[PDB]
Amino acid sequence: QVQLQQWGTGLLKPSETLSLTCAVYGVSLRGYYWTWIRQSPKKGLEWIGEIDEIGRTKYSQSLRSRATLSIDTSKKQFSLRLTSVTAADMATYYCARWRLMMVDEVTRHGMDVWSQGTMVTVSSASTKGPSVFPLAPSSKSTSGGTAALGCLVKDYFPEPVTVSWNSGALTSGVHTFPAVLQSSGLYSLSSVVTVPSSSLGTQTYICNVNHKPSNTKVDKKVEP
Amino acid sequence: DIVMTQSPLSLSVAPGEAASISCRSTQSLLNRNGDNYLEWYLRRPGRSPQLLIYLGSERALGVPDRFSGSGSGRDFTLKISRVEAQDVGTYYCLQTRQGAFTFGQGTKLEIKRTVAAPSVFIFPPSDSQLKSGTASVVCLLNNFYPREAKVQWKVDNALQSGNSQESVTEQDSKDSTYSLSSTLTLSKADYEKHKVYACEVTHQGLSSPVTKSFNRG
């Protein structure tokens, strides 16, 4: 029931500075070490640094030059700052809580709690809102009892897009495919759901798209 | 400066069989007691990392008995006695000994399940998109295995290349199936020019290529 929530800069232009902050709900920061771990295909899984409740920090040598770990026990939130962001700094970033036990040496019992993840994109492109188009059921979409419909998130920058069906009520058969990056530099994504064909017409299917970088939340109706 | 190299980069195991991901470090992770500073993490499809093994052999909380770490010194082996559908994802080994805190390459676990066939659906473009000046036709391949598939687009029986982008979901943690979405995009005028737009699907589970088509244009 421990929750680690991450927020901060999702889109940076090169040489600007990254801000990411993790708010811990459930436990005090006291008694643990707190680490920022990033994942990218270029860097793989990479340890950035850990922090104490006192304020003591341990950094990776490569990132030591431009990384500043902070903590505020009263507000129960720690932060990582990465300066002079380069194309190698574009990655998914996580905050983790170490579990440690002292038997004459601080032994580490693993990072029990991780965060949701915050994609950080390094690019000069401006934020563009997505276009939502309905993929509708038809004789071609239907296949016996199973019928297929969809929601198309056509053109958006940067990456974070969240799609839910029927305001979260419909998770049965909901497939949200990985986005594709077009030649135009913008992304494209499709989310689909397979329902019984009898449900068409009588039931009301809606797809909720939420692109927070552009502050664009649209609810689109899929009509057969 | 401690490098972690994992032996099997990708592994497909049948449900009920055993998997053995191996890890190796340049320098020994041993301490005075005999404990090793190695931890195993599992990143399921779409989720954040979870902790499996710590201190070489100790299971985390909520980690089933199947997962079992072992090994000492530089070589280490994570063993899963009975792989199940939920075990899908990429696995990592991490050293905590010498302050580089370096992970491993990664290792995808895939469930060797029954050969299945794609349920092919095709979606014509939206009325709103045509008004926007572009036209996108979607083809859907649902719940198939293996991952390998071919989705060719044919407009008026003319194969079209360079106008489509495809995306494949990861293995379903329940039925171990995949799904594919291909989107043919082109101009509004170019969509008025041709008549029939078909999506030809090739898969192992199918006897012959399956084609689906809509004819308005």
Mutate to test the interface with A, among B30, B126, B206 (most CBs of A within 10 A): B126
Last residue of a domain, one of A67, A97, A122: A122
Last residue of a domain, one of A94, A122, A150: A122
Residues A114 and A146 in one domain: no
d(C-alpha B201, C-alpha B212), whole Å: 8
Instruction: Provide the 3-class DSSP secondary structure of residue A167.
Output: helix
Residues A118 and A185 in one domain: no
Beta carbon pairs, A and B, within 8 Å: 128
Residues A171 and A110 in one domain: no
Residue A74 lies in a domain: yes
Q: Say yes or no for a CB contact (<8 Å) between A152 and B179.
A: no
Which residue type is seen at B104?
Answer: G
Chain A partners within 8 Å of B107 (Cβ): none
Q: Does B175 touch chain A (CB under 8 A)?
A: no
How far apart are the CA of A139 and the nearest CA of chain B, in angstroms? 9
Q: Say yes or no for a CB contact (<8 Å) between A114 and B49.
A: yes
Strands (E), chain B: 4-6, 10-13, 19-25, 38-43, 49-54, 58-59, 67-70, 75-80, 89-95, 107-111, 119-123, 134-144, 150-155, 158-160, 164-168, 178-187, 197-202, 210-214
Q: What element of type H or E holds B192? A: helix B188-193
Q: Say yes or no for a CB contact (<8 Å) between B140 and A140.
A: no
Instruction: Provide the 3-class DSSP secondary structure of residue B20.
Output: strand
How far apart are the CA of B210 and the nearest CA of chain A, in angstroms? 13
| Sign of the CA dihedral running A162, A163, A166, A168 | negative
Domain segments of chain B as ranges: 4-111, 119-214
Domain with residue A193: its CATH number is 2.60.40.10
All residues at 6 or more sequence positions from A23 whose CB lies less than 8 Å from its CB, including other chains: A4, A5, A7, A75, A76, A77
Last residue of a domain, one of A82, A102, A122: A122
Residue A183 lies in a domain: yes
Chain A partners within 8 Å of B108 (Cβ): none
Strands (E), B7-149: 10-13, 19-25, 38-43, 49-54, 58-59, 67-70, 75-80, 89-95, 107-111, 119-123, 134-144
Chain B partners within 8 Å of A177 (Cβ): 167-169, 179-181
Question: Which CATH code, of 3.30.70.270, 3.10.20.740, 2.60.40.420, 2.60.40.10, is assigned to B4-111?
Answer: 2.60.40.10
Residue A127 lies in a domain: no
| Sign of the CA dihedral running B125, B129, B131, B132 | negative
- For this PDB entry, the determination method is X-ray
Residues A217 and A159 in one domain: yes
Assign residue A51 a region: left if phi > 0, alpha if psi is -120 to 50, beta otherwise?
beta
Of the candidates B171, B46, B44, the residue with the CA atom closest to the CA atom of residue B116: B171
d(C-alpha A153, C-alpha A173), whole Å: 18
Domain extent at residue A200? 132-221
CATH for the stretch B119-214: 2.60.40.10
To 5 degrees, how large is the angle CA A146–CA A151–CA A152? 130
How far apart are the CA of A51 and the nearest CA of chain B, in angstroms? 13
Of the candidates A58, A10, A61, the residue with the CA atom closest to the CA atom of residue A36: A58
Residue B23 and residue B77 in contact, taking contact as beta carbons nearer than 8 Å = yes
Q: Say yes or no for a CB contact (<8 Å) between B100 and A60.
A: yes
Chain B partners within 8 Å of A136 (Cβ): 123-124, 126
Q: What element of type H or E holds B66? A: none
Residues A116 and A7 in one domain: yes
